[PDB]
Design a protein around this ligand. Structure first.
Ligand SMILES: [Mg+2]
Lengths: 431, 430
């Protein structure tokens, strides 16, 4: 019963860990030995895990359970062990198919965080609200550069990228300082009031709203967005939270039924393109798109939206940041931490790593919580902590049926004893 | 006698102004009318100039003197006026030749800030130390990214670009906070102590040292860098200021004579490549290169410099930042948008990258634009005493009848319709 936290080596920006020092202290209190593989890449220093009771050691062959965040290289895999990380093999991705064979060859039991769900189907291990926190900092930083490219200096120029701040607290202070300048009237008058639209009910939307609340903000209802976009006070920023009933209407009767939409989303359409989009400066998209869910904006909608010293904006919509996705059809490509922003012009072509031109600024980062890795690590570790003890007690050599697993851990096992279970047998047929 | 401050439209990053509101208040106190062309690009808001006494007006045809920072577009030029900006036509630059003839056609008097000098030859109007302040913030930000690409999370990751901060004070707070983490021991042990070398005696070198003083720094002599580079405390950063006598020696006897080096720099060489460079993590170059001054580093010197969970640095030298020809292998310059480039052992430069085994290099032509408010106040303070004589000038009257000081007078490039004798060579140089 020995636990090891492996070093992340997927990419340079993976500074997170599956467990935080306070979680390691709890595991050592239960009587389990925890090995910590040294890593200069992790945002939490090795000395903090030593204080919690972990042992700094390169050789983690002693451990039967190896915890990581992202996929490990094939050569690093140790045979006859239990590994837990994000495999991204659920859709039989070719890149991770070379990894999957080594796990089967080494007779490794693999638990995937993404498959861990409760009885209602909600994932029980995730990074919480921090993707929204990081997304809001980035999009405010991107709007400063985009507005400067259009010729307007704004206080948003004084907000850096999310990864430029030690933690969310230091970023909050920077947001307040830029907000102070806005309340002082340092915004350019010709661009008009700025309106922020938040979509979704998940934790990422609340995290994005938390950063927004540090600005001089006033929340208005969606139907008021038309009014505020023209007569709003320039010493404030305006925000609105989009709910289902605000924009979803039936194709037949334009009626919204909460129970019917959840069971039958194919019968509904979205009025976001005409009711909200023309009066939106910045869209923060947190909607988790499901089967037959209507899209907020289409390529046809973008064509409608895209048409001396102090010029006005060419179009009201400046930027869109998705913090959770198919909701926006013309957002076909994703950005990275290194190149956070791209432009979608009226010619329906994407200019990557640019804030210039007449297009719409777009931001779509797949690993937003990596920009706030310390706070993301504690949040992830809090969710994973209750399931850790049953994972350490697992034995990679014994069959799955003899293991004392809960349904959350059991259904998440992709590989075990060299062979894929029935529920994941389909992977082999999918290339 | 009407003065106007034109709107900057050279590039998106030109947020500076030739005069600050506090300077406009003094000019209005003298009784002169000041027009302010509205500009969303300016870092200082239009209302602050209105408070100082300026008048917000798009049409500045009433003014006889138009002050800007950088070049205006040719179409915007108003005939029979006096303009003051950086023209960059003294060396007959191809790009600005189309501007220069247009100025001659409009019969405009052009004063160039860079040509304004004192009797000793020192420029009297400049942006001061702020280029060095911005350069130090950027290079610390670049070292965090470069070290992360090498596999090391560092507190330098928590320092942004200069243009991400409202002023130098907010940047100082971030540098202090990263310094706190260094003093707490959060730096990775495997990379070892970090050594910073500052060169030059100009104002920009002093500005970069000011940001460095906010870190947990210990200053050592340049020759001590060899010892500290191995046994230095990992909770401190180490810096040294390079003087002439430390690295400059004559070829024949290895002796340094201050008076002779100034008169005959060709007789001297620099051993910085062997005595200090191998033990330098980050080089901040502020030396102003002269005719026969020896080079600090050569391409062959770079070839000599370029050769499990906690890896060591591939080579001691990580980054070089130029804040001012001293370094030949720095053949290309970077921009604010793409601040860093890598010079590899293959002698090819990969721009906008912090990855690979090369040497990270940063060389921005307009560093003060990242701190435009403080750069505007410094530039305006130097220009303010010469402003009044420019307002009294008349573009239609001959240059010889104008009451100009020698500083302003020699800086007139175009005068009335034809270039003066001192600038006659420009047309023949094309
Ligand atoms: Mg970049």
């Amino acid at each position: 019963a020995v636990l090891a936290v492996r070093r992340e080596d997927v990419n340079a920006w993976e500074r997170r860990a599956p467990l935080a020092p306070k979680h390691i202290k709890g595991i050592t209190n239960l009587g389990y030995k925890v090995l910590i593989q040294p890593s200069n890449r992790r945002a939490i220093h090795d000395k903090d895990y030593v204080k919690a009771g972990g042992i700094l050691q390169e050789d983690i062959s002693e451990a039967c359970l190896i915890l990581g965040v992202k996929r490990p290289p094939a050569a690093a895999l140790m045979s006859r062990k239990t590994y837990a990380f994000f495999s991204h093999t659920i859709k039989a991705q070719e890149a991770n198919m070379g990894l999957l064979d080594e796990i089967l060859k080494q007779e490794i039991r693999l638990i995937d965080y993404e498959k861990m769900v409760d009885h209602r189907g909600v994932r029980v291990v995730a990074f919480g609200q921090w993707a929204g926190v990081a997304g809001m900092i980035n999009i405010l930083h991107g709007m400063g550069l985009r507005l400067l490219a259009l010729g307007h200096h704004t206080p948003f120029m004084h907000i850096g990228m999310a990864h430029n701040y030690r933690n969310s607290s230091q970023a909050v202070q920077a947001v307040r300082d830029a907000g102070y300048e806005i309340s002082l009237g340092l915004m350019p008058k010709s661009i008009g009031p700025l309106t922020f639209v938040f979509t979704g009910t998940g934790n990422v939307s609340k995290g994005a709203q938390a950063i927004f609340n540090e600005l001089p903000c006033e929340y208005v209802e969606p139907h008021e967005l038309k009014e505020v976009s023209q007569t709003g006070d320039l010493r404030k920023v305006y925000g609105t939270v989009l709910s289902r009933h605000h924009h979803l209407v039936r194709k037949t009767d334009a009626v919204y039924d909460p129970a019917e939409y959840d069971k039958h989303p194919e019968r509904y359409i979205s009025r976001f393109n005409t009711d909200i989009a023309p009066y939106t400066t910045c869209l923060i998209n947190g909607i988790y798109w499901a089967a037959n869910t209507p899209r907020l904006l289409t390529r046809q909608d973008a064509q409608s939206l895209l048409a001396e010293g102090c010029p006005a904006l060419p179009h009201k919509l400046v930027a869109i940041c998705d913090i959770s996705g198919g909701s926006i059809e013309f957002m076909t490509e994703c950005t990275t931490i290194e190149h956070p922003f791209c432009m979608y012009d009226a010619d329906q072509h994407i200019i990557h790593d640019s804030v210039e031109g007449s297009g719409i600024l777009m931001c779509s980062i797949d690993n937003l919580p990596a920009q706030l890795p310390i706070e993301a690590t504690e949040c992830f570790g809090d969710m994973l902590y209750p399931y850790v003890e049953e994972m350490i007690l697992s034995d990679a050599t014994q069959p799955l049926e003899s293991q004392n697993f809960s349904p959350v851990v059991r259904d998440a096992v992709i590989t075990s004893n060299g062979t894929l279970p029935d529920k994941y047998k389909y992977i082999q047929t999918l290339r």
